[PDB]
Symmetry: D3
Subunit: 294 residues, 6 copies
């Protein structure tokens, strides 16, 4: 990974120096939290998309683990802006990470507080999905509203499964059999002119999902939030997923069954395009979501 | 901090201070690591590692679950484990082998990161009984997290349950499965005794404990009838005895659950006998169980 | 027997006696068929089929779930459906389109049997309210059977619930989902009314009824507030009204569930108004709903 | 399908004449029951394997549907023997089927009794499995102890999924996440010399499974019955499945993870071979399971 | 409990006579239904909050158990007004109860119909001050799940149901918390041992769906009040961690009124104390029940 | 119910005095525990079946609710023997009961400790004849599931639990059946509204696993008896259709003894009448409880 200078607990250092004890609690028990934040190039230079909203979730994830982050939100935000500038990035993916150190290896993480923190970044047909044989964890098994390290063993298993089956991404159902979300994407589907966003259920409350719903509504679409089954998606006119890295990705096939016309549909493509216009500063109406680094 | 000393890092030992890895390591972000807990006990004939092969086999089995490739043959890992005891001059210690996905990429898919990085570290190492509290967090279903493997990510569930129990004033947490049945402790297999019979809980969503396996064999050799069953919280509440097993936990009696005393309210005779015979076995004082020991020197 | 008369068999009509298929047909052994329920009502301007396109669209959608190929374009099927009414001289009738996997092979995998065989048949076709009993059979979870499609196999579940209710002295069965919440009748979507508000049950594991959709539109046009929610059996027990919808069932008031009277214990005013407006709509007596009708002659 | 003469409600008729109304209840609602019975060639001619046991289950399946079979067990057995003789079969698969006719199309099948019956027959590396995203129905959703037509929509979905993913067969989990069985095979796994048969849970009580357990025990193996998870199979020394058509089939890989050595193992191969010896009349000890037609 | 005169099947009697056979079906099998109604003192005398709505539920709960209440709703309402008057109470908690008697002890309660009915009322010993309200309630998620909708009738106030509430409450208290937060069997948030839950996030007030919870009248009242004040209210299903990161969390109930929640599972909610929204809702709610809100007088039944 | 003299917290009193406050916690929240014990007449006087085992469970049920029973097990056992003697009973049903009193009415029952205790006993009005036994009981699977192990304490005889049993029993009766068969939330067979289930298939006797059911003493007794007679007994989890195709099905309970099941959900079991195994087990069981089986005298406690 070409990260370059990484912010390590207060100070930037060369990538090669950004290391941590192999006895770190997080490395053994998945006790870490992270975020996914993107910077896009605009006519006025790099702009970070919904920075504060992402940082807030970062601290929220930490609270779920009762993990203590030894920095104020403002400092992390400044670190995030600086990881872009110092590395001379224009368009990049920023990865803040807080993890429990190597003070002790009992399964209880509290003794390891405060958490160590770092911020790294690196320059940045229709998706085919397969329904995973791995269900997304119930809300009382793993904290699904938080981006906690350990949670992604579940995403990792589903992703490898999908790829091995010849698809691009996995669609996970909850333990009851209802659609949940992709290994790392929130789901949407369109039917008879109406855009359906799936309820939060056990899924993460996506910021891209949020942005897409606002944009859809601003464009005049009717948007409903519902619980959905796989066959509701099979027969939808369109299906698409959202996420910081994934942006707005159309889904043209699920479980080898074509969605609608079998290729990216007009609604998803339009939302994606307007979303890209929003993140690149071409829409005054969404300027409030941007934080120009320069 | 942890006083581990020399740590085996992918083929060679290095000072603990040098045993570090990139913060961009896949496992540090996604919980994609596997580990083991192995113990060496002091015996009249030097340190002896308890059931080393079974532990290493499970280490590789856990890796297979994540489709993780361990770039070392089992024999090499076993040697590294014996050497971590020697080189550090340990007599009694907890050994922690760990394999994790490195920093080649950060997509959720771990495969592009193979082979895994590997390290082995180690550090020198009842009457009243333990007090448990049933967690408000259920152990993950068999199709949510691989409960038969010691996969790093799995322990977020254990961590949450453990903090909860300690916060409530208990020693350890007792987790139920999503259906409401007893599963296991945050990191211990459960047993209970009623009317002379020893009940080992079914594997269900729990890890197939090696200590559990040992205590069952021992119990049968002592002449106890052992049954494997599914259990509810109130079946434990009215048990004569309840105890936990684990490499670190060994055999620990449980005297109270959810503020309800178990039997007499103190460690029971059955759990104590099992514990005593187990400690005799791991310390080379039981000829019939010598096959379970691997002498370091 | 059934008096269907001329039946459309894969492209052409034949006497009912000739409308037969191999007993080695995949669908006869594995439930691999899909079907629809469509009605034609008599109007001052001749027979009219209610929402023909929506029904045909669902027919194809159901086929997609089984990855079944229907060797006919929607337009041809729609024509066959109009012709089944004409050729038999029906004025009011129930139309049953059916596509099933033939007899090319009997491995559980249906794909080798594509394309599907297709046929369309039809046969000529409240106050006290219906009595329901909650079934001891739960409607299948969304990852067990495709509850959004009218797949033949799905109805073993419906058949079991229906026989049970009738045996218990009730008219129809009310099924719950595996979690314990109300799902739907053996073949009817459920609604309930409380304090002036009409509650349509969420789709959950139920079929997305076309009659349900019609009654919701009608209800809103009449000025009623309509909410879509999840419901428990006792929320129905204390409702002012409860009613069922389906192509065959139309709009049927429910006066009792599990021997517990609903509201006054007879059909309620809201269900009756919805029913009345629906029958006016399907009989061409509502200009605003003409788009839902397809006149045969 | 080359079936030849088919027994149709009391009398044999040419295949082409073995037809039923497209208005048959079973064709619309999956209300039928069937069996899978095999005949193997022996030195003394064709021998049907565990005939009576299969017929008993046939009638048992019917009781679950409250379906009335208008023939006595003895008659069906005679029909089954005759479908082999008359067609001059040596080794074949026999398929008895009872289905609800076209008397009425209400979802309730009772009015359609008695059921129509027929009996047809036709001459007869390690399997790679993938875990299905379709769970086998709970015991209060579909009658899993009976071979009821409608049940197989669930098997059909799982099978197509597996094949489409590049595997040979699907492994289904129950709704709780535990291993259930294949789309149409009971599961077994071996670990440290012990043979583990999965409990019945929501699975069909396989006759091949039964035979295999008896054989295993007769051979001296220790056999236990347990509930199992997918990772218990992932780490087993061996895994295999049973069924009339499948016989004893070794499983060398599940979800792209090799089982043991990655090829058919010694235990499964041995059980399979002894099973074939039993069904072909080479084992006096199992002669009781055979019914010679000639 | 100092109840004084208690209405027993049609007539008032001293508490000492308000007793029933220890062979009563309900004492052995939880076959009873009850209500929790409050009378708040006003300058015009005691006013009972939403009496008919509570009485309708009392009868609705009885229908679930197929229990027959041998009195017209109007008789019960009169009894409820009189228990207040006859005891000279001002503010007080009213507890109507209908239970299966001692005719027989088979599990089937039908042979025991009609049910016996009683209405008792008593005064409060103490009230939480504003300081305590502001500190907020501390919750702990219970290891006991609220019963699925096909196990126990969650929309009815059936006695047997409260064994579940009792287990969770004792658990929470033993853990050092004030109240328990129960999840449903699926892992989602249900309600307190006896309180409906709400949470506020980014300006929006979220009321939890009914799922397996009781359809609280205080919950209903709070929603109406919130909307009348201009707040946006949404009804959703929620997880424990959605509450952990909410700006505010609060619970409702006749006895609990509107109670701010400052911490759940040792994780502070928002600022760690009661927030402005819950406190504002509590105030308006109290102004409503004490007859100081003209727009809500329709909810009050003055005893005098 | 004609109980006569009833033991009330340490002393016997006429039934008429055996009453408790209608403000008792258990009457409002199902917070009670009870037992079902029988005394069978013998030529040596009444003999109580497995008294200590029943008493141990009574106390075990109390521990689940964290209910304090202010009497030593020995005192209760004496009370149980005396209720029989003092009423001059021969064969009779004994019902011990401990319930939370009227100290306070918050859901938490702890403030109400210690619990009140009573022991009542009464005679049977009628018994099933062999003809009825042979016809067998007809069951119907309930639409109510037995509570999961983390919702209601299924191993304890807690009053509140029986709301679930009551709902299922009424349902079965209304449907025209004799008893209800409940499944667990997962869809598997649990037990009757108050009876443990067994089924026989191809010579083997299958006792159902404990899962969420009560660990029946009659169930335990039947298993011991079956094995002593040479039958092979296996313990398994079962589905409704495994019972549909069983050779025989029967249920056990103190009141139900050993009852043959001839039909479930309108589907006949085996021959459609009681089978030889269940009838044989019932006979030996009855010979045991009536003191005609020397090998089982250890299970009997003679009152005189
Ligand atoms: C990060 C993530 C998402 C996407 O959320 P965004 O805020 O839109 O980036 C979706 N699902 C999971 C499981 C995630 O971790
Ligand atoms: C390691 C572990 C155990 C104990 O297993 P042993 O082989 O006996 O050390 C039990 N449960 C969990 C979750 C574990 O990780
Ligand atoms: C056909 C059917 C309905 C009714 O749907 P309509 O489109 O209104 O005819 C409801 N439930 C099930 C299970 C059905 O098969
Ligand atoms: C027929 C069948 C089997 C195999 O049973 P055998 O009696 O061994 O042929 C296994 N599973 C299912 C679902 C089946 O239908
Ligand atoms: C009584 C009760 C409430 C509160 O409802 P209100 O009508 O507002 O008094 C909430 N939950 C439960 C379980 C209750 O019994
Ligand atoms: C009392 C009871 C039984 C019977 O148990 P026995 O000890 O044999 O009397 C069975 N099920 C339930 C739910 C019970 O309460
Ligand atoms: N698809 C990717 C993410 C989400 C996203 O930003 O689309 C989830 C897994 C971990 C990496 C991020
Ligand atoms: N209680 C501890 C362990 C198990 C054990 O060895 O008892 C599980 C959590 C991770 C550390 C090990
Ligand atoms: N009640 C009937 C239907 C639905 C309907 O049209 O109301 C479902 C079962 C199959 C026949 C149709
Ligand atoms: N694999 C096949 C069967 C089972 C068997 O005989 O192995 C199940 C699906 C329907 C055809 C039979
Ligand atoms: N916390 C109390 C109640 C609710 C209430 O009024 O807040 C529920 C249990 C039964 C008594 C009432
Ligand atoms: N059928 C009755 C009992 C069991 C029995 O003794 O059979 C359970 C409910 C409570 C009374 C006892």
């Amino acid at each position: 990974i070409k990260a370059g200078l990484i912010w390590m607990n207060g100070a930037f250092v060369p990538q090669e120096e950004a290391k941590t004890s192999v006895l770190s609690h997080a490395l053994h028990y998945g006790t870490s939290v992270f975020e996914g934040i993107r910077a896009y190039e605009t006519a006025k230079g790099p702009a970070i998309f919904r920075l504060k909203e992402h940082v807030k979730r970062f601290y929220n994830s930490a609270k779920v683990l009762r993990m203590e982050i030894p920095f104020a939100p403002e400092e992390l935000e400044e670190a995030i802006k600086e990881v872009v500038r110092r590395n001379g990035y224009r368009s990049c993916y920023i990865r803040p990470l807080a993890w429990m150190g190597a003070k002790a290896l009992g399964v209880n993480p509290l003794p390891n507080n405060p958490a160590e923190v770092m911020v790294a970044a690196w320059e940045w047909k229709g998706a085919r999905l397969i329904t995973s044989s791995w269900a997304r964890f119930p809300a009382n098994v793993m904290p699904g509203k938080a981006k906690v390290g350990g949670n992604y063993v579940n995403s990792a298993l589903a992703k490898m499964e999908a790829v091995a089956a010849g698809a691009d991404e996995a669609l996970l159902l909850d333990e009851e059999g209802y659609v949940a979300e992709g290994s790392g994407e929130n789901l949407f589907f369109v039917r008879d002119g109406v855009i359906y966003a799936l309820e939060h259920s056990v899924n993460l409350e996506g910021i891209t999902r949020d942005s897409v719903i606002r944009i859809a509504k601003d464009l005049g679409y009717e948007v409903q939030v519902v619980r959905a089954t796989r066959d509701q998606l099979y027969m939808a006119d369109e299906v698409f997923m959202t996420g910081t890295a994934a942006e707005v990705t159309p889904v043209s096939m699920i479980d080898w069954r074509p969605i609608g016309k079998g290729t990216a549909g007009p609604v998803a493509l339009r939302l994606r395009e307007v979303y890209l216009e929003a993140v690149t500063g071409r829409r005054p109406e969404y300027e409030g979501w941007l934080t120009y680094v320069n």
